[PDB]
Every structure is written in structure tokens, then in C-alpha cells.
Amino acid sequence: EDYLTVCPFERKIPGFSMSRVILNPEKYPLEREMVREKQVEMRQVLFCKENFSRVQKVLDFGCGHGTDVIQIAELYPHIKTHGFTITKAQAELGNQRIAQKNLGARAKIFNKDSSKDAFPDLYDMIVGIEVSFHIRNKHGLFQNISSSLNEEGTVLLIDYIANTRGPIVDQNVEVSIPTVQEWIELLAEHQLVIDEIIDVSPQIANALHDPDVEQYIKHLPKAVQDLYINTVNQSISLERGWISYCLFKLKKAPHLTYTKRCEWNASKLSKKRPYPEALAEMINSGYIPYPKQQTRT
Numbered sequence: 028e029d030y031l032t033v034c035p036f037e038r039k040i041p042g043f044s045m046s047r048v049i050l051n052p053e054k055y056p057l058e059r060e061m062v063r064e065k066q067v068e069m070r071q072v073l074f075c076k077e078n079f080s081r082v083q084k085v086l087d088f089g090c091g092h093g094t095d096v097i098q099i100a101e102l103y104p105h106i107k108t109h110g111f112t113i114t115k116a117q118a119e120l121g122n123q124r125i126a127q128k129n130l131g132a133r134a135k136i137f138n139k140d141s142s143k144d145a146f147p148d149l150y151d152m153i154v155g156i157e158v159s160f161h162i163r164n165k166h167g168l169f170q171n172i173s174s175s176l177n178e179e180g181t182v183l184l185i186d187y188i189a190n191t192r193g194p195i196v197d198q199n200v201e202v203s204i205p206t207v208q209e210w211i212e213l214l215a216e217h218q219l220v221i222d223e224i225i226d227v228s229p230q231i232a233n234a235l236h237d238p239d240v241e242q243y244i245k246h247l248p249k250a251v252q253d254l255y256i257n258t259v260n261q262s263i264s265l266e267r268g269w270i271s272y273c274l275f276k277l278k279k280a281p282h283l284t285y286t287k288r289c290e291w292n293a294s295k296l297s298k299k300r301p302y303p304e305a306l307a308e309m310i311n312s313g314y315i316p317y318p319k320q321q322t323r324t
């Protein structure tokens with residue numbers, strides 16, 4: 028029951044081991060709070076151009092137990108939020124927490140497959156944080172997103188781009204990462220253009236710099252060990268430059284031609300904004316609508 032994304036560090040912290048902190052949160056609770064603050068910060072950068080007063084409906088198409096679906100709805104009482112998660116236990120837990128907070132009239136989580144089951148509404152904002160690289164059928168997913176996106180709406184993604192000639196695929200973990208060109212055409216095919224693309228790769232690599240991790244996790248139960256090894260592999264691919272971890276802010280441009288959307292997306296991906304730049308801009312603007320950092324007392 029936490030934020031489960033990787034997080035950006037401006038610098039490597041010597042001695043800091045992400046695997047020990049993530050996998051032993053009861054032994055390193057205050058370090059886990061340090062990580063949480065960076066998880067929150069990265070989400071703030073993702074959301075900091077949205078006007079939540081204008082938003083009326085939000086979809087999270089890989090909502091896990093529904094963290095943002097619940098928090099957005101409780102922070103903004105005029106918003107209705109929907110979440111899709113493939114995991115039955117996560118939907119049940121999310122809908123329990125929705126009930127425990129009396130948000131059932133405005134927040135609802137569905138145990139459904141975002142690449143196959145049609146989203147039930149039209150949304151002003153659609154969020155997918157570390158979702159789409161777990162999904163094999165990319166066109167089904169982005170057909171679903173585009174068809175449920177209001178004309179003036181935004182799609183917000185946190186996802187990987189492959190910097191290789193071909194996509195980066197791994198069937199045993201069912202991970203598929205499109206190349207730059209594949210992203211250009213996938214978005215353009217479904218009427219979507221990149222408004223902003225922010226590269227977090229160096230800062231994610233700083234946080235995941237964990238030199239003994241492969242030895243450490245061999246001292247953990249096979250369950251744990253099997254789970255975390257995908258974070259290790261992404262760490263390795265990030266360090267090598269094979270993939271990039273990015274924040275996507277997309278808009279719909281349906282009255283525009285495919286070729287024109289393609290050229291736009293190409294220009295944007297050739298000049299990704301460094302995360303420190305986007306973060307400094309957010310801080311200097313003073314506008315940080317969601318999430319808020321937790322504070323003592």
C-alpha cells in the first residue's frame with residue numbers, strides 16, 4: 028500500500044541501496060520515506076500542467092489497487108474517477124478503500140483488461156503510470172484510450188522508450204518496449220500528439236545504482252527474488268542506454284492528418300526535456316496541484 032514506481036535522484040547517494048529499502052521497508056522506514064518523496068515529486072511533474080478545476084472525469088488504466096483514483100477523488104470532490112486493473116485482488120482492495128472513505132458515488136475500480144475491455148466513459152484525463160510496457164496489444168490499448176478521450180483531454184504516461192532499431196521484448200515477463208519510431212506511429216495512428224516528453228533516465232539510474240543488488244537478492248526468498256529481478260534488468264538496460272524512462276503528456280489532434288501527427292511526434296522525441304529542467308520549471312511556477320507531499324502534524 029504505497030507508490031510502487033521507481034523514482035528520480037538528482038545524484039547517486041553512496042551506500043544507499045534501493046533494493047534493501049524497497050524490499051525491507053520495515054527495516055528502513057525513513058529511507059523508504061525519502062524514496063516516497065521522490066515518487067511523489069515525479070508524479071507532481073507529471074500532473075503539474077493539468078487544471079483539476081476543469082477536469083470532471085479521470086481514468087487510470089492501470090490503477091493497481093487505485094492510488095490516484097482514490098486520492099484525486101478525495102482531494103477534488105467534483106471529480107469522478109475510474110480505474111482498470113487486471114488483478115482481481117487489487118480491484119477488491121481498491122473498492123474496499125473507496126467504500127471505507129465513502130467515495131463510491133464518484134470513484135470505482137474495475138477488474139478489466141485495458142487492452143481488451145472498452146473503457147466505460149469519456150474522460151478529460153487518462154493516466155497510465157508504468158502500464159503499457161506490460162501490454163502486448165498496443166493498438167488495442169491505444170484504440171481504447173483514444174476512443175475514451177474527450178477532444179480537449181490529456182493522456183499522461185510514465186513509460187519506456189527503446190533506443191534500439193527494434194523493440195525490446197521479453198516474453199517470460201511479458202514486457203515489450205516500443206522503439207522511438209514505433210511510439211511516433213502508434214500515437215499518431217490513434218490521433219495523439221506529444222505535447223511534452225520528459226526524460227527521467229539519468230535520475231532513475233542514479234536511484235537504482237545498487238552495485239551489490241544481484242548478490243543481495245540471492246539472500247532473499249525466491250518469490251521476492253523473482254519479483255525484483257525485473258527492476259534489476261530495467262536498471263541494467265537504463266544504465267546501458269538501451270531504454271529511456273519518460274513522462275509523456277499527450278493531446279488529441281483528430282482533425283489533423285496522420286503524416287502531420289507523425290512529424291510532430293518525431294520533433295518532440297528528438298528533443299526530450301531533461302527531468303531537472305521540467306522539475307525546476309514546476310518549482311519556479313509554484314503550481315503543484317497533485318499530489319501533495321505528506322507532512323508531519
Ligand code: EMC
Nearest residue numbers: 032033034049062
Ligand atoms: C524502485 C524504487 Hg524508487
Ligand code: EMC
Nearest residue numbers: 211286289290293
Ligand atoms: C519523419 C516524420 Hg514521421
Ligand code: EMC
Nearest residue numbers: 075076308309312
Ligand atoms: C509551468 C510548470 Hg508545470
